[PDB]
Structures are given as C-alpha cells and as structure tokens.
Amino acid sequence: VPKTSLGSPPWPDIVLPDPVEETRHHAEVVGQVNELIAAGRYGRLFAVVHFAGHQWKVTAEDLILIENELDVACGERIRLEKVLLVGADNFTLLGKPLLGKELVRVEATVIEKTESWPKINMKFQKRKNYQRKRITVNPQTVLRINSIEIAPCLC
Amino acid sequence: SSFSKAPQQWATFARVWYLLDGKMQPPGKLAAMASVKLQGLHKPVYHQLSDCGDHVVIM
Amino acid sequence: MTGKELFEMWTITNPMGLLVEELKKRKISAPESRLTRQSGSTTALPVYFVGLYCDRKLIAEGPGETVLVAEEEAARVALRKLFGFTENRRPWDYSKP
Amino acid sequence: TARGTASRFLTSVLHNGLGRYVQQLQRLSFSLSRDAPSSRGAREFVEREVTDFARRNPGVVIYVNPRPCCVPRVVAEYLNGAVREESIHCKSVEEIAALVQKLADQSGLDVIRIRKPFHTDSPSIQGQWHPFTNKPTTLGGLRPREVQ
Amino acid sequence: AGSQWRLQQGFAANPSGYGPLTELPDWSYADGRPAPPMKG
Amino acid sequence: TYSSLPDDYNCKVELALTSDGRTIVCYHPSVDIPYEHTKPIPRPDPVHNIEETHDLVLKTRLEEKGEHLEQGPMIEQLSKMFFTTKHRWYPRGQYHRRRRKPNPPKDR
Amino acid sequence: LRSRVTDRYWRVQEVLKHARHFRGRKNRCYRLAVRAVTRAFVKCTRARRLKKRSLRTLWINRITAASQEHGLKYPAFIINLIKCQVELNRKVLADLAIYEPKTFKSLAALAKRRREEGFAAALGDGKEPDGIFSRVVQHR
Amino acid sequence: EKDIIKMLGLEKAHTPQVHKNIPSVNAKLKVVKHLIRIKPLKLPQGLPTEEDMANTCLKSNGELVVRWLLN
Amino acid sequence: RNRIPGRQWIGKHRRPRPVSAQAKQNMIRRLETEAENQYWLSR
Ligand SMILES: [Mg+2]
Ligand SMILES: [Mg+2]
Ligand SMILES: [Mg+2]
Ligand SMILES: [Mg+2]
C-alpha cells in the first residue's frame, strides 16, 4: 500500500469497544459507585443546581444570592429539585439533563429578604436635550445551603 | 487539596518556564503559542488584571 | 469553625516531628521527602513540590517557595490527612436527633 | 457607582441559618404624633397591625412614642449594632406594614454593592487547579534538555 | 450553541424552551408540600 | 480497558451510563506520583566564613554583608531579578497614595 | 413676593457627592462636575450592559484554556457536551475548571468520547450501529 | 410589507403564529415570504379538546402535542 | 499611502470590499428557507 502525506487522514485512528463489553464495564462501574454511596465513603459533595433561571455551583454550608423575591418567609427550608450535576472527591453523577429527586436532595434555608443597593440607569443624548435618570432597587433573597444528600438508589 | 492559604496561592499563581525548538518551524505558528503562554491563555485561572504570565525560551 | 483550618488554631512548631511520632504510633517506619515537581531554581521566586513517601508510597504532597517550606507544608498535609481534618471531609451535621 | 461608593462581600452575621435561624432585627422604635396630620398612617398602624406583628415576631422589642413631632420616624436596631432610620411620613397602612416586614427580613448589614452573588467557604473540593495538575511526570523528574 | 442538533432531535433551539429545566418547579418546601406556582 | 483521555495526569477517569439511560457516572480516583518519577532533595550547607582563630568574629563575618546602590541601578537590578520592567518600581505621588482604600474587603 | 432658593447648598451637594473621587477641578467646581457625573452615569449603564459580555468572554477563555490543557478544542468540547444533553453554562464550566479539575477532566473525556462516537457513526453511515453515549433520552 | 406583517400578527419576532391554509392569507404570505418561515401544523394526537387546553405544548419540529407533562 | 477618494462608501470610486464565504453561505441558507416557504405556499 502506497504511503503519502495525504494518503492517510492526519489524525490517529479511533477504535471503539464492543457494545456488550461497554455495557458490562458500565454496569461494573455503576455497581462500584453505588457500593461507595451505600458505604458512605464520600466526604464532601458539590452540586450544580439550576434555580431562579441561573445555574449555581453549591457546596454544603454555603451562601447564595437570588435577585428576585421568593414567596417564602425568613428561616424557612426549601428543597431544590432542579439538580444538574452532583460531584464528590472520587465520583460524579451527570444528569440527562437532570438528576432524580429521590437520588439527590438539596435543602437551603432562607435568611434575608432585603433590597439591593440603588442602581443608577441614566440615558443621555448629544445636543438633543435628552436626559433620563432612574433609580432601581431590586429585592434580593439570601439562601444558606446546609446539607447535600445523595441516595444509593442508582442502578 | 488541603493546603494552607499561602502555599495554595503560590502553587496556583506559580510561574512556569517552557521550552520551544525553532528549527524548521514557522515564525507565525511559533509566535502564536509563545503569545498564548506569555498572556497565560493556557491557564483556567487567567485574568486580564492578574499578573499570570509564563516564561518561554525559544532555541 | 466553618472554613477554618486545624493548624490555624493549633499552631504546632514541628510538623515533621509530629508526623513521624504519629507514624510511629500507627506502625509506620519513616517518611521520605522527595522532590516531585519544581518551577525555576535560579529565579527570584522558585516553586517546589515535595512529596512524602512511606515504603515508596506517596501519602501527601506540598508546595512551597523553598524546599524547606514545601517539605513543612507536605508534612502538614500528611498530618491533616492522618487526623482526618481535610478540606474534603464530612461537613458538620446540623440536624435534630 | 461602584467606584464612588463602598463595597462588601456576601457575608452573614454569626453564620446565621447554619445551625438555626435568628431574626436579626432586635428593636423597632416608632416616633409619631397624635395631632400631626402626617402621622395618620403611623397612628392607624399602631391601632391596627402593631399587635399582630408583635405576636408574629416575639423576638423584636417594639417601642411606640407619641410626641410633638412633625416627621414620623421608625428606628430599627439590629443584632449587629447597626441602626437604620426610616421616615414613615405620610404613608398608608399597607406601606407601613410592607416597610416593617422589609426591616424585619433585613439582616441589618450595609446596603451597598455586593461584589459576588455567592459565598462558599473552601470551594477547593477534590483539589484546586495548579499548573502542575495536568502535566504528566517524566521518568526521574528530569528537565526537557537535562542529561542524567 | 448547538441549535441545529436540538432542532433535529426535536428539542427547542434554546434549552429554556418548554424543557424540563424550566417547566418543572425549581423549588419546594422541605416538608414536601408543593411550592407556589411561577409567574412565567 | 478504554478511556478517551490518558490516566497519566492526576486521576484515572472511567465513564459509565446508568442502565436507565438518564444518568452518567464517572469514577475518577486520584493518581499518586510514583517513586520512580522523583528526584532526591538537593541539600546545600557550607560555611566558608568560619575562622579557627575567632568564631565570634567568624559568625559576624557572615552577617556584616551589606550594600547600597543608587535608585537607577537598584530599579535595574530589581527588574532583572523579577523579569519585569523598570516602570513598576518607581514610587507614586500623594494623589494616588491618599486614595488607596485602607481596609479593602477580604473574602474567604 | 420675592422668592429665593435656600436649599441650593443641598442641591449642589447632591451632585457633588458622586464626584468626590475625581481628578482636578471636576471634584470642586459644580459646572465642571455636572458634565462629568452625567457621563459617569452613562458609562456606568454602558458598562453594566457590557459586563455580561465581558464575563462570558472571560469564561469562554478559561474554558478554552482548560480544554486545551486536556488536548481538546473549545467548539468540539461545547458541541459534544451539548450532544450529551449536559446543559451547563460557561460560568459553571469555568467554575468547575478552576475548582474541580477531576470533574472537568471527566467532562472533557465524555466530550471526546461523544466526538469519537459521532465520527465513527458518520464514517459508518449505518442506522443500526449506535454509540452508547449517542442515545437520546426524551423528557419524563 | 410592514403593514402585511402587522396585520398577520407577527409583531413579535421568533414567536410562532397559527393561520389558515386559504389563498386569502396565502397571498400575503407570498408577499412577505422573504421575512418568514412557514411550516405545516402536525397533529399526531389530534385536535385538543376542552379538557386538554391547559396541558398542550408546541414542539419546535412543527407538531402540537395534546398531552404534555403527564404528572 | 493608498487613499480612498471621497467618502468610503458613496463616491464613484468606492472601497473594493469583497464578498465572503460566510456571506455566501448565509445567502444560500436564506434562499433555501424561502424556497421551502414558497413550496409550502403552493397548494
Ligand atoms: Mg419577562
Ligand atoms: Mg439583558
Ligand atoms: Mg476622505
Ligand atoms: Mg467616495
């Protein structure tokens, strides 16, 4: 077989494993991860969670600020359902596109329902005598995430 | 992972010296990676205000 | 104590001595300090990484400006790992039993 | 303006809400008048809603003071020692109740620009990136052009 | 990005469009009782 | 044995998919540096200022080292040492030194 | 009834308080302060609009750095992560790259696996052969 | 063309609108065909009834799903 | 050295700014979309 510069593609050839072997390996890996979860050998867990239109990377005993008011009183506990990603020192669960509520539970306590610092929005136009000044005060909510829980229900 | 604040900061913002052979190499392609390394665009901790910069020695 | 470090309030003086005493208690012979990685030696701001090997097994690693500081940091990391006070430990449980 | 005003990070007093939640509002003192027309809202709020608010929140000491004053005022002192003074001059009962609820829900910290909307202690779980965390080690730790 | 792939698979061009990331309730009480509905 | 990325740098990644199909897991144990890829710590300890006649003077011989240079040479030396420009080391005026925040906010 | 202004001091101070950190006579003279304050607010609004773009570009640059550190290009990484139905924005990706090197390397490996599966499927042009990670999951 | 787009109810861009397949509106669609994308409405589950009006959705592929997010 | 007489995009001698492959692909895509529209507007 002739060998030229353009005879072969300029990238290494990729070989994929057989589907049955891949399924067996995935089953073994998920079983090992489930055994780790059941034994509780995980120290700390972080989670990427979608809330209030934003995605937040949150660990235990953390603080987050939400730019919109929530219909909850201060000191109330709230369970965050939209979990995008869970991770720990040795393992990591990726949702497609979300994790299970029974699989992962995250709880946060409302601390402060306050108002943000005044934001100035001023529009000015050249030599047309157009000035428009507004002061915006945006209600904000502070959430303290206390614990991140994971259940061994993973097949 | 469990480092003190000063050594962790030093490790995070440590400077690195890279080597680059220039024999039979195009100046533009050499300068592309040289500029990337000098600006620190190869570091996820890069920032314009930060002084993240790595030394490059081209022979 | 949230976000704090054990040594920030313990203030020990000889991390290497404390580590070797703890290893003797745990039936470990001796830690060996080996230079794993470094960045510049003649520069004004050298960076060194020193790891601790027991029976040629890495137990901890530490960065530093100088080799001695890197070794001390590696000893501190090994001591924290042995005592369980690590950044990846279980967060304190705040619940109602 | 960020460059013109001060700034602070997202912080909580005494790590509130971790073990338990503590209402940061300590005392709330209303100063009003009985004959000034401007104090109508304060008088009506004292008549109607102050008792219900006191029952709902027992952790705040509520003081009421009628005095020959022209500007009805409300002073909230928080557990931080911070004092926030507001004017209830010519406001309806609903506005007074909303302001009181806002003061109760406030943590008493400075109302300035917060640099980051998040605050996580020790976010370096599983490690923190360093220029050596993705570079493979060579045999013996030799330099690229160092001969052993 | 990746809008054409989502359109081919049937999902919205924007992941915020009628997806589970937005239609589902983002939060609920710790007791399990449902949260108030979202204005959007 | 298959992995998209080599397991040579800091961890060994093993990807898997749940039998349900809605969850992706990855076991990534950390990788320790092998003993064969390290070098011994260099030790430099030498005291050439020691004198057999008077150790009291020998000890001060290693501490009485001092030098003073002009502003230009000092800035040039600092720039050469730290691989920077000479414009950074020059001082600043009252207008800039007064407006610095005495107590900047601190995180962590 | 001759009417005069008495609160002109406070009227001037309410504008001067926002210009106390300027350079020159713009922090003292009122006539030179009003123009600077107005332009300062206009620039504040423009920069508030541009802050989202600037931070998005910074996140993209950090993601490019971390992906090239794993030998993978940013467009390929992004498209392959999207194909795996992993909806993580650039902010979260940059945070993971900075603080979760193992997680980011796992994501890069998943993206490379997805890219290899897509290339194999394109080369094969076979309906029956489908990659393990190329399967599409509907909503539930 | 502006008036045609106004009378067609397409003031808000990137928002689908449903119209008849009659030539009367086809004339205007031909007039402003260079500014719009037109697709045929698909009903795999048929016309929604009065009991399914609150549970309907419009997928981007061009079909109208009657039962959306069952519990 | 090389000056553009008059305004850049008004005068008799304009900027020689060419057409790009991105613009060509965009025009082709728009043409395909409009062709599909005119097909659906046939019956
Ligand atoms: Mg809206
Ligand atoms: Mg916007
Ligand atoms: Mg001209
Ligand atoms: Mg011209």
Side-chain angles (χ1 to χ4, degrees), chain A, chain B, chain C, chain D, chain E, chain F residues 1-42 44 46 66-108, chain G, chain H, chain I:
Chain A
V1 44
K3 295 186 58 182
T4 58
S5 59
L6 303 177
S8 58
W11 53 74
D13 199 330
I14 49 179
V15 281
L16 273 65
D18 299 0
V20 284
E21 300 181 356
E22 271 289 343
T23 53
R24 296 173 186 177
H25 182 52
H26 293 184
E28 295 179 351
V29 171
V30 70
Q32 178 182 359
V33 173
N34 194 275
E35 288 292 337
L36 288 165
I37 298 170
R41 281 172 284 188
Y42 52 92
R44 183 178 287 266
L45 314 91
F46 63 94
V48 176
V49 39
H50 176 83
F51 180 81
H54 298 275
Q55 305 180 10
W56 313 83
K57 183 263 175 181
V58 164
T59 333
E61 313 174 356
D62 290 357
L63 288 175
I64 60 176
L65 181 62
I66 280 77
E67 214 68 24
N68 55 266
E69 179 182 346
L70 300 179
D71 297 327
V72 281
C74 297
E76 293 293 337
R77 312 193 77 264
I78 285 178
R79 183 188 189 273
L80 305 181
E81 299 183 357
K82 296 181 178 178
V83 181
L84 280 165
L85 162 65
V86 188
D89 201 330
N90 295 327
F91 57 93
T92 284
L93 313 184
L94 286 160
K96 252 184 173 179
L98 290 172
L99 284 313
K101 296 186 301 180
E102 302 178 0
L103 179 60
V104 55
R105 162 179 286 267
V106 178
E107 303 171 351
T109 306
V110 185
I111 295 184
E112 178 186 14
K113 305 178 59 179
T114 180
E115 287 188 338
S116 63
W117 69 295
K119 300 181 180 179
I120 301 179
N121 180 87
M122 190 176 188
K123 297 181 180 180
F124 167 78
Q125 198 153 5
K126 299 181 180 179
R127 68 191 153 278
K128 298 185 187 184
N129 193 23
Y130 171 58
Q131 302 181 358
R132 174 181 176 272
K133 178 180 179 180
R134 184 196 280 184
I135 296 180
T136 297
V137 187
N138 197 340
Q140 295 178 337
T141 305
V142 182
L143 301 185
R144 167 84 73 177
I145 299 92
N146 309 114
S147 60
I148 299 179
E149 304 179 7
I150 178 176
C153 51
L154 179 58
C155 300
Chain B
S1 180
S2 57
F3 300 157
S4 301
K5 297 179 177 58
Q8 178 63 62
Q9 169 71 10
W10 204 262
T12 302
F13 283 78
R15 301 214 184 105
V16 184
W17 291 66
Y18 298 86
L19 179 57
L20 186 57
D21 197 336
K23 183 177 61 179
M24 297 297 301
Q25 296 299 319
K29 292 189 179 181
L30 293 182
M33 53 184 57
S35 176
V36 166
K37 297 302 178 181
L38 261 55
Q39 300 178 46
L41 303 178
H42 65 285
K43 297 182 174 180
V45 299
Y46 161 79
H47 188 257
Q48 299 181 355
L49 295 176
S50 302
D51 202 2
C52 47
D54 291 1
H55 303 265
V56 173
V57 182
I58 300 180
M59 55 184 180
Chain C
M1 203 187 60
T2 300
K4 293 291 185 177
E5 289 289 341
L6 173 64
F7 295 144
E8 291 174 348
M9 52 211 59
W10 200 0
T11 69
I12 61 179
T13 310
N14 188 14
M16 180 60 60
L18 194 45
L19 171 67
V20 300
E21 295 302 324
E22 290 294 334
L23 290 182
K24 184 182 303 176
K25 291 186 177 181
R26 300 293 178 86
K27 197 169 53 60
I28 303 296
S29 60
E32 303 181 6
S33 60
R34 292 299 295 264
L35 184 63
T36 297
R37 298 195 190 99
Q38 62 178 4
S39 182
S41 302
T42 61
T43 62
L45 39 123
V47 183
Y48 302 100
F49 269 88
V50 172
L52 303 177
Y53 288 88
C54 297
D55 303 328
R56 298 181 296 100
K57 251 59 183 178
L58 188 63
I59 58 177
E61 192 178 2
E65 308 87 4
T66 62
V67 189
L68 304 180
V69 176
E71 177 184 5
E72 178 179 353
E73 183 66 22
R76 292 180 179 273
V77 172
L79 192 63
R80 281 198 292 256
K81 287 187 176 182
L82 290 183
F83 289 164
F85 198 94
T86 323
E87 293 278 32
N88 308 330
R89 75 179 181 271
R90 278 286 174 89
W92 202 269
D93 199 331
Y94 297 95
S95 301
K96 303 179 180 180
Chain D
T1 302
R3 284 176 173 266
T5 57
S7 59
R8 70 176 180 87
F9 283 89
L10 182 61
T11 179
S12 56
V13 39
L14 212 61
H15 298 264
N16 176 87
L18 181 54
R20 66 183 64 179
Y21 166 75
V22 180
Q23 180 173 347
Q24 303 305 322
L25 182 60
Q26 178 182 0
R27 79 185 66 258
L28 195 63
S29 178
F30 303 93
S31 61
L32 50 87
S33 179
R34 68 162 184 176
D35 295 353
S38 60
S39 306
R40 167 193 172 186
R43 285 174 295 189
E44 216 165 18
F45 179 82
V46 170
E47 292 173 10
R48 299 179 183 178
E49 304 295 331
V50 73
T51 309
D52 300 0
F53 176 79
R55 291 200 179 99
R56 290 191 301 270
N57 302 268
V60 46
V61 189
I62 303 181
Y63 296 96
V64 179
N65 297 269
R67 71 177 71 261
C69 68
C70 301
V71 179
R73 299 182 182 274
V74 45
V75 177
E77 304 186 13
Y78 295 87
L79 273 68
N80 311 335
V83 175
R84 198 172 189 266
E85 192 171 7
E86 305 296 329
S87 179
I88 49 182
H89 168 255
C90 296
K91 295 184 177 181
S92 62
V93 185
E94 293 75 10
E95 295 175 341
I96 303 306
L99 181 59
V100 170
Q101 276 290 341
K102 187 185 309 300
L103 292 179
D105 295 1
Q106 281 179 357
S107 177
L109 297 181
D110 299 329
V111 277
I112 54 183
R113 189 188 97 268
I114 306 180
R115 296 188 176 186
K116 298 179 179 59
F118 37 78
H119 178 65
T120 76
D121 296 332
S122 68
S124 57
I125 181 184
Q126 99 176 177
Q128 183 172 347
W129 185 94
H130 52 93
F132 304 100
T133 196
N134 296 123
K135 297 184 177 180
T137 56
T138 178
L139 179 58
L142 303 179
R143 279 170 277 268
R145 293 309 174 95
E146 181 183 4
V147 47
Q148 181 180 7
Chain E
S3 173
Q4 299 294 337
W5 182 87
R6 279 187 282 260
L7 291 182
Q8 292 179 1
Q9 301 305 323
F11 307 97
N14 189 34
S16 303
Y18 62 79
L21 265 300
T22 316
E23 298 294 336
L24 299 179
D26 53 341
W27 68 271
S28 61
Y29 288 90
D31 196 17
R33 45 190 176 93
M38 302 179 300
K39 322 299 177 182
Chain F
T1 302
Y2 180 82
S3 61
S4 301
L5 298 177
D7 309 327
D8 303 0
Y9 54 107
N10 187 86
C11 63
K12 182 173 185 178
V13 183
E14 308 293 336
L15 301 168
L17 183 73
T18 307
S19 60
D20 304 1
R22 306 197 298 102
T23 308
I24 308 178
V25 308
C26 46
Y27 184 63
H28 47 70
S30 179
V31 163
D32 307 329
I33 301 302
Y35 197 86
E36 301 81 10
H37 294 239
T38 58
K39 51 185 175 182
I41 285 181
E67 185 186 2
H68 184 273
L69 300 179
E70 277 288 342
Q71 188 73 13
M74 181 177 60
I75 292 181
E76 203 282 334
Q77 176 184 357
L78 294 170
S79 61
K80 190 62 176 58
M81 288 176 57
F82 294 103
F83 297 92
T84 58
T85 63
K86 71 171 185 175
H87 309 74
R88 180 185 180 92
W89 309 103
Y90 280 94
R92 213 62 63 91
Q94 294 283 352
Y95 175 77
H96 292 267
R97 287 189 286 99
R98 293 288 185 177
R99 64 181 302 177
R100 309 187 74 262
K101 287 175 291 180
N103 42 12
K106 183 177 182 179
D107 200 0
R108 310 298 173 84
Chain G
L1 203 159
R2 180 165 174 261
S3 182
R4 305 181 63 179
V5 179
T6 59
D7 59 333
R8 192 171 303 180
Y9 163 80
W10 292 263
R11 293 225 193 101
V12 172
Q13 287 292 340
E14 201 173 19
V15 186
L16 288 190
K17 58 181 181 180
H18 301 275
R20 293 301 180 181
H21 61 282
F22 292 171
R23 171 195 292 262
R25 295 192 288 180
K26 297 190 301 178
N27 69 90
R28 291 165 293 181
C29 299
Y30 179 79
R31 184 177 301 177
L32 303 179
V34 178
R35 305 189 192 94
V37 169
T38 295
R39 303 193 77 262
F41 291 164
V42 172
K43 294 175 178 187
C44 178
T45 59
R46 176 181 49 86
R48 186 187 300 102
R49 172 161 294 183
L50 294 175
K51 183 179 179 181
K52 309 174 181 58
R53 317 175 188 181
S54 302
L55 291 179
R56 180 176 173 93
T57 53
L58 179 61
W59 296 334
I60 289 179
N61 297 326
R62 294 178 171 178
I63 295 168
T64 57
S67 301
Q68 294 172 34
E69 199 170 11
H70 295 298
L72 187 58
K73 296 185 177 182
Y74 174 85
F77 173 82
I78 293 299
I79 62 180
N80 296 297
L81 195 62
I82 290 299
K83 289 174 182 298
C84 297
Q85 304 181 191
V86 181
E87 308 299 329
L88 300 183
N89 47 23
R90 292 116 180 92
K91 170 186 176 182
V92 159
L93 294 181
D95 297 8
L96 291 179
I98 296 179
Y99 292 99
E100 284 74 25
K102 304 177 182 179
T103 305
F104 196 90
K105 177 173 171 180
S106 171
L107 291 179
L110 176 61
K112 189 174 183 178
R113 174 62 182 274
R114 181 61 175 87
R115 193 170 183 260
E116 292 180 1
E117 290 184 3
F119 288 160
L123 180 60
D125 290 327
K127 299 172 301 189
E128 300 179 357
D130 299 325
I132 305 304
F133 298 94
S134 72
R135 303 175 182 177
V136 183
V137 178
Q138 306 299 330
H139 74 286
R140 281 187 171 183
Chain H
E1 297 186 8
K2 288 183 175 60
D3 295 358
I4 294 298
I5 224 60
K6 176 182 179 181
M7 67 184 65
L8 284 182
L10 298 177
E11 289 289 344
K12 185 72 71 180
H14 295 284
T15 46
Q17 188 72 13
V18 50
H19 286 266
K20 303 176 182 178
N21 206 333
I22 57 180
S24 302
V25 303
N26 287 331
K28 307 176 184 180
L29 294 183
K30 295 168 177 181
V31 168
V32 295
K33 64 182 180 60
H34 49 267
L35 303 177
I36 54 182
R37 176 184 294 101
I38 301 180
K39 298 297 182 177
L41 177 55
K42 301 179 182 178
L43 305 178
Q45 304 177 3
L47 284 176
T49 181
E50 279 290 339
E51 303 179 1
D52 301 331
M53 298 299 182
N55 302 331
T56 183
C57 182
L58 177 59
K59 285 190 174 182
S60 60
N61 70 86
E63 67 183 8
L64 187 69
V65 287
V66 178
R67 307 191 63 177
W68 182 254
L69 257 59
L70 300 181
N71 296 328
Chain I
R1 170 181 175 88
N2 300 275
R3 297 180 63 259
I4 299 181
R7 202 178 175 89
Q8 194 179 185
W9 319 88
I10 284 200
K12 174 188 299 179
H13 310 153
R14 297 180 185 180
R15 184 164 170 179
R17 169 196 184 181
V19 58
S20 300
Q22 276 289 120
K24 298 178 182 180
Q25 294 296 334
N26 295 138
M27 179 156 293
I28 291 180
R29 182 192 313 172
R30 290 181 54 189
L31 288 175
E32 292 179 347
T33 304
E34 189 163 4
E36 185 174 353
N37 284 273
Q38 72 185 11
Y39 161 81
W40 288 118
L41 292 179
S42 59
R43 292 154 58 257

